[PDB]
Enzyme design. Sequence first.
Site, PDB file in Angstrom:
ATOM      1  N   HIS A  40      49.312  69.452  22.526  1.00 20.91           N
ATOM      2  CA  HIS A  40      47.984  69.202  21.932  1.00 20.91           C
ATOM      3  C   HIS A  40      46.971  68.541  22.910  1.00 20.91           C
ATOM      4  CE1 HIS A  40      49.435  65.138  20.674  1.00 20.91           C
ATOM      5  NE2 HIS A  40      48.146  64.850  20.765  1.00 20.91           N
ATOM      6  N   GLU A  62      45.552  54.984  43.767  1.00 23.37           N
ATOM      7  CA  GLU A  62      45.426  56.197  42.976  1.00 23.37           C
ATOM      8  C   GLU A  62      45.486  57.475  43.819  1.00 23.37           C
ATOM      9  OE1 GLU A  62      43.036  53.881  43.287  1.00 23.37           O
ATOM     10  OE2 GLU A  62      42.643  53.052  41.312  1.00 23.37           O
ATOM     11  N   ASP A  84      55.605  70.227  20.750  1.00 27.07           N
ATOM     12  CA  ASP A  84      54.390  69.606  21.295  1.00 27.07           C
ATOM     13  C   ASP A  84      54.707  69.110  22.714  1.00 27.07           C
ATOM     14  OD1 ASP A  84      51.853  68.697  21.586  1.00 27.07           O
ATOM     15  OD2 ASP A  84      52.148  66.935  20.322  1.00 27.07           O
ATOM     16  N   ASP A 171      52.882  50.007  17.970  1.00 30.62           N
ATOM     17  CA  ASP A 171      52.878  51.470  17.916  1.00 30.62           C
ATOM     18  C   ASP A 171      52.083  52.010  19.128  1.00 30.62           C
ATOM     19  OD1 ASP A 171      52.098  53.812  15.163  1.00 30.62           O
ATOM     20  OD2 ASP A 171      53.388  54.091  16.814  1.00 30.62           O
ATOM     21  N   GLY A 175      44.681  58.111  22.309  1.00 26.58           N
ATOM     22  CA  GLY A 175      44.553  57.875  23.742  1.00 26.58           C
ATOM     23  C   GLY A 175      45.907  57.809  24.466  1.00 26.58           C
ATOM     24  N   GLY A 178      50.784  62.352  24.838  1.00 30.54           N
ATOM     25  CA  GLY A 178      51.278  63.047  26.048  1.00 30.54           C
ATOM     26  C   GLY A 178      51.991  62.090  27.006  1.00 30.54           C
TER      27      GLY A 178
HETATM   28 CA   LIG Z   1      42.108  52.565  39.035  1.00 26.00          CA
END
Ligand SMILES: [Ca+2]
Lengths: 223, 56
Positions: A40, A62, A84, A171, A175, A178
Site C-alpha cells: 500500500h 544519509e 501487503d 502502537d 507514517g 512499510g
Molecule cells: Ca537527516
Amino acid sequence: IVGGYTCGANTVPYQVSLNSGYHFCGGSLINSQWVVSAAHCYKSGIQVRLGEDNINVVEGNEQFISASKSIVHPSYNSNTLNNDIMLIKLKSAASLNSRVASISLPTSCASAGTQCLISGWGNTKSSGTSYPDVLKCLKAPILSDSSCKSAYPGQITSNMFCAGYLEGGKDSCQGDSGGPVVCSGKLQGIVSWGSGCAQKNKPGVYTKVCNYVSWIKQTIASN
Amino acid sequence: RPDFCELPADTGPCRVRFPSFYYNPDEKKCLEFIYGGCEGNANNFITKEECESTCA
Ligand SMILES: [Ca+2]
C-alpha cells in the site's frame, strides 16, 4: 510510533524513509540494492532515504537513492490488504556501513509473545497529530492469532499478525507503514494497518514476512 | 452543502502519511488530519480551499 522512545541516531541502520516530496512510509534494507516495504506504500518516483535520523535535517550519514523498480506482490489485494508487501530496487547499490546496514530475512516464523522492535517517523499521538524529527522505536510482543482475530473479526489472513498492547498506549501509526518489525535480529513484520492508533483492543496489524521469503529471493534473482 | 461534511475525520486503517483536510462542524472550519491512504469517508480534501468551498 505512539508510546515509543527516541531510538538514537543510526541505531536502527536498516530503517529507511520513503520520500515523494516528504516522508510518507518506512521500509527495511535487506541488501545493498533492495528494500522491503508495504504494497500500500506504492508510488511512482519514490526516493529512498537511508542513514536517516532527523529526516528534516541533513546530518551527514544519509544516502538518498532513487527507486528504479517498485514491485508489489502479484496477489496484493488493496481491499483486504492481504499480501501487503513490496520490493523496491535502488537505482544504484547503497554503500553499506555501520549506519546503513541490511537486516536478515527470517529462516522460521516468530511465535506469539516474542518481543520485537518496531520503528518509524509516523505520528506519535493516539489523539492528535505530532510527527517527530527523529526516528522513534517501540518494543512490542507478537500477539496470539486468537487475540488478533478477536480484535479484527474476519479481517486477519494467514499473511498477517498483530503485535502491540491490548491495553492501548503503545502502537505504530500513520507514517509508519512499510517499516520494520524485527524480532531476534530477523525481519518478521512490515507495518500495515490498524484501527486507529494505540487504542484499546486494536493492536497494530503487520505483514507476515516469513510467508514471503521465497518470493523475495525469486524477485531479487529475477530483477 | 453535502451531508458528508458532517462525517467525522476518518484516517482509515492504512498507516501511510497523506496530509489532508476535513470539515469540523463544531469549529465551523476545515482542519488538518492525517489520511492513511485507504478507505476513510468523503470528508477528506487535499486542499483547505476545496474543503471550505464545499463545506464551510
Ligand atoms: Ca537527516
